[PDB]
Each structure stands twice: as structure tokens, then as C-alpha cells.
């Protein structure tokens, strides 16, 4: 398995997910830095430096997007499944392993669906742009 191709395909997939989020109209108008209270369980302020931090971050977004009822989020959730596997394949190359969070998400989906979806996709885009920008620099396990 060519690692050079895996690193290039990981970057291409991240760009693909970012483009999908740009097409979801109600997310581009929202500032990913401007904070919303009650949705602190969604990765945002964290710098995300390590392979295990990247993996745990994407798993949280994966769990969040599964609950949302849109087909746009279902496709992004499938891309995140490929992205997590690519990160595990990159962790394998450099001989390191990665492991497998309150459930107040159920309440915020029931009361504030618009805020949950918009903030999740807006935070995901910011997280992916951070992962992409740090993939050029050799990441720690």
C-alpha cells in the first residue's frame, strides 16, 4: 500500500468534505469562531495536533451527524468514516495504535435542531481546515 497515495487521498477527501459543507447554504453565513453556549461538546476551541486527537475529534462529529436527519449530513458522515480509516492507516505507518463525552446532545437536538446542525457543520469545517493545514507538518501519534 503506497503511503504517498494515502496522504494525498486524505488531503483530497478533506477538501471534498469542506466543499460539501460550502454547498450547504445555511452554514457558510455562520462564523465558526463566534461561540454558541450549550454546544461545548462539539470540537472547536481545541488545536487538534495528534493522530489520536484527530481520531477522537472526528468520532465525536461522526456521532453528532448520525443523529441529524438530513441526507447531506449522511454523505458527510460516510466521508468521515473513510477519513478515520485513512488516519488509522497513516498511524499504522509509523507503528502506533489509536483507541475507540456527555449525551446532552439528545436534548439539544430536540430543542434546537437548527443550532445543532449549523454549528456542527461549521465547527467540522474549521476542524478539517486545521487538520489539512497540519498534515504538511509531520503529525505525532
Amino acid at each position: 500500500v503506497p503511503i504517498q497515495k494515502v496522504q494525498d487521498d486524505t488531503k483530497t477527501l478533506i477538501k471534498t468534505i469542506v466543499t460539501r459543507i460550502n454547498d450547504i447554504s445555511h452554514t457558510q453565513s455562520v462564523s465558526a469562531k463566534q461561540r454558541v453556549t450549550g454546544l461545548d461538546f462539539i470540537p472547536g476551541l481545541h488545536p487538534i495536533l495528534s493522530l489520536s486527537k484527530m481520531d477522537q475529534t472526528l468520532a465525536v462529529y461522526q456521532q453528532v451527524l448520525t443523529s441529524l436527519p438530513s441526507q447531506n449530513v449522511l454523505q458527510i458522515a460516510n466521508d468521515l468514516e473513510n477519513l478515520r480509516d485513512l488516519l488509522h492507516l497513516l498511524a499504522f505507518s509509523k507503528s502506533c495504535s489509536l483507541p475507540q463525552k456527555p449525551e446532552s446532545l439528545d436534548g439539544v437536538l430536540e430543542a434546537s435542531l437548527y443550532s445543532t446542525e449549523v454549528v456542527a457543520l461549521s465547527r467540522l469545517q474549521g476542524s478539517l481546515q486545521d487538520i489539512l493545514q497540519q498534515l504538511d507538518v509531520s503529525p505525532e501519534c
Binding site: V36, T37, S115, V119
Partner: protein, 306 residues
């Protein structure tokens, strides 16, 4: 911390052009903040201008929207999310503002036999809003239409059929020619109901007559005239006006029109420039008082030459 917001009211259902106000309480960690600290936001995208804010009290802030435009849907979201925020920091809870363009026009047409009335309307402004029902409602007054139609509390639903052009067609059969039919579109939403502006139609006044029949066109060479004659349709019984279109028969007819306002006229004599040409003639009719539609043009009538 224990931060929470309360909207008064939690949701608003209104129509285009209306005004709407939301009140809010921001309980920051078990204590209500001053209304001066509250700022408002629209879909977490843009701060609503402070000009629209109103300090109801030391703890209650208010936002007023004037002459509301129809809310543009963002995917599954048919409402606009209005936010009560504690300065730069907003909360996850929002107020749902639904503004629907309820200005639907209903046009009715009674057949040439005065047996039925078909009403047509477009749901172009309602198609986006699903999870709520849309139907034509009506009430019939024994005789005539009131000067200003009103949504009568007692009404009945009318079955409408979606057509291939995207419009709904509702057929009333049999009809009451001189009864006033007040109709409007009702949108039954989960939050309540909205009614479009009512219109009252007298079936007798929206008849599209059948075209004039037995249309003949002949050139009398003794006078050099083109004589056109016709028979008015069976209905309506009211006085009619006629319109005759005539031209030289060819690939693309260059039409000329003649108007007849004499209700008992069954013919017109036109002085033409060329006696040896074939002319094509069609006649159509409408109520002299203008209370109705123009009929379709009759089947073409032609003169001869040999």
C-alpha cells in the same frame, strides 16, 4: 454554566407584509441579565440592527420586525431562527419565525353551457412548506356577492386536483349562477392557520361563451364588399359584443379587426381592396357589459375565387 433563554412567544406564524415582535429573558447561571446586554441575531449569521430593539423593562428585551418578507427556506428549515444573545455569546435556543406568502390569486371560469365553474390557483408560494396542509375553502351566499368579501367562520373544503402545469383546478358542478361564491386558500400549519385574501365570484359573471357559430364570409362583387355573418352562441342570454378578425389568406396572416357593439347584429359588411383574393375570417364574442371572458375565435371561414 446554567445559561438559558426564553422567548415570548416561542414561535410566530404570520404572512408577508405583517409586523412581528419577540420578547426574551436571558438567565445567565441562575440570574437574569439586564435587557441592555441583550443583542439579537438571525440564523446565527447576522446581528439584527439595534434600531429594531426595544427595552421593555430592566430584564426584558424586545425585537420588532416590520413589513416581513417571506422566509426563504434553508433546506429542511422553513422558519428563520431568531436569537436572544448575551453580547458576543449566543445560546443554542432560538425563536421560530415563519412568514408565508399567502397572496394566492384564484381565477374562475364558467363553461359555455353554464353547467360548471372551474377555479384555478398556483401553490408556487406554498410548495416549499410541507408538514402542513393547503386547501381551497368556500362559502356560498344565496344571491350575489358582498361589496367586500370576508372569511366566513362557516366554510366547506373544496377538492382540488393538481394539473400537469403545476396549478390546482377545482370544479363546481352543478352551479348556482347568481349565488356569490366567496373562496380563499387556507394553510393549516402545526402552529395555527393562515387564510389568503378572500375573493367573491358570481358564476354568471365569469362565463367564457362558446364561439359564434355558422360563420360565413362571402364577397358580393355587385357592391365589392366582404360580407361576414355569424350566429351568437346558445349562452349567455345577456347582450353580447363581437370582434371580427380578417385578412388575406396566406402563410402568416396579417390581421385587421372590426368591433361590433350592436347586440342584435348578425352580420358586418367590410369594404376590401382586392375582390379576387381569398380572405380568412374569425369571430369571437363577449358580454357587452364586460362581465365575462372573450370566447375562443370561431373556426375560420374562407371566401372563394375561380
Amino acid at each position: 454554566g446554567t445559561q438559558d433563554v426564553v422567548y415570548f412567544p416561542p414561535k410566530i406564524l404570520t404572512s408577508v407584509g405583517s409586523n412581528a415582535s419577540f420578547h426574551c429573558i436571558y438567565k445567565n447561571e441562575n440570574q437574569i441579565i439586564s435587557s441592555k446586554q441583550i443583542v439579537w441575531w438571525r440564523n446565527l449569521a447576522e446581528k439584527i440592527p439595534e434600531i429594531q430593539y426595544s427595552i421593555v423593562s430592566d430584564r426584558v428585551s424586545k425585537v420588532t420586525f416590520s413589513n416581513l418578507k417571506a422566509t426563504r427556506p434553508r433546506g429542511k428549515f422553513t422558519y428563520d431562527a431568531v436569537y436572544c444573545c448575551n453580547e458576543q455569546a449566543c445560546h443554542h435556543r432560538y425563536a421560530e419565525l415563519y412568514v408565508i406568502d399567502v397572496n394566492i390569486n384564484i381565477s374562475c371560469e364558467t363553461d359555455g353551457y353554464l353547467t360548471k365553474m372551474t377555479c384555478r390557483w398556483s401553490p408556487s408560494t406554498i410548495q416549499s412548506l410541507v408538514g402542513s396542509t393547503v386547501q381551497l375553502r368556500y362559502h356560498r351566499r344565496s344571491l350575489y356577492c358582498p361589496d367586500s368579501p370576508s372569511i366566513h367562520p362557516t366554510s366547506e373544503p373544496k377538492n382540488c386536483v393538481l394539473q400537469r402545469d403545476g396549478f390546482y383546478e377545482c370544479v363546481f358542478q352543478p352551479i348556482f349562477l347568481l349565488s356569490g361564491y366567496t373562496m380563499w386558500i387556507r394553510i393549516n400549519h402545526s402552529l395555527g392557520s393562515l387564510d389568503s385574501p378572500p375573493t367573491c365570484v358570481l358564476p354568471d359573471s365569469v362565463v367564457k361563451p362558446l364561439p359564434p357559430s355558422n360563420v360565413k364570409a362571402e364577397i358580393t362583387v355587385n357592391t365589392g364588399l366582404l360580407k361576414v355573418s355569424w350566429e351568437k352562441p346558445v349562452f349567455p342570454e345577456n347582450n353580447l359584443q363581437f370582434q371580427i378578425r380578417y385578412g388575406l389568406s396566406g402563410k402568416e396572416i396579417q390581421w385587421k379587426t372590426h368591433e361590433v357593439f350592436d347586440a342584435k347584429s348578425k352580420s358586418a359588411s367590410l369594404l376590401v381592396s382586392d375582390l379576387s383574393a381569398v380572405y380568412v375570417v374569425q369571430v369571437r364574442c363577449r358580454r357587452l357589459d364586460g362581465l365575462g371572458y372573450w370566447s375562443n375565435w370561431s373556426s375560420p371561414a374562407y371566401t372563394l375565387v375561380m
